[PDB]
Design a protein around this ligand. Structure first.
Ligand SMILES: [Zn+2]
Length: 46
């Protein structure tokens, strides 16, 4: 179950954990924590 969603343009933010780019800073913060915590959540949407 490996997803791949690439946009366009070097984002000012990058997750130094997996390797994903985020346009908004707020979003990243959420993702970061998302990593840890297994609550009926495995596969991603996009
Ligand atoms: Zn990440």
């Amino acid at each position: 179950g490996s997803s791949g969603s690439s946009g366009t343009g070097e984002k000012p933010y990058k997750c130094s954990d997996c390797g994903k780019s985020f346009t908004w800073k707020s979003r990243l913060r959420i993702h970061q924590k998302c990593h840890t915590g297994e609550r009926h959540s495995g596969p991603s949407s996009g």
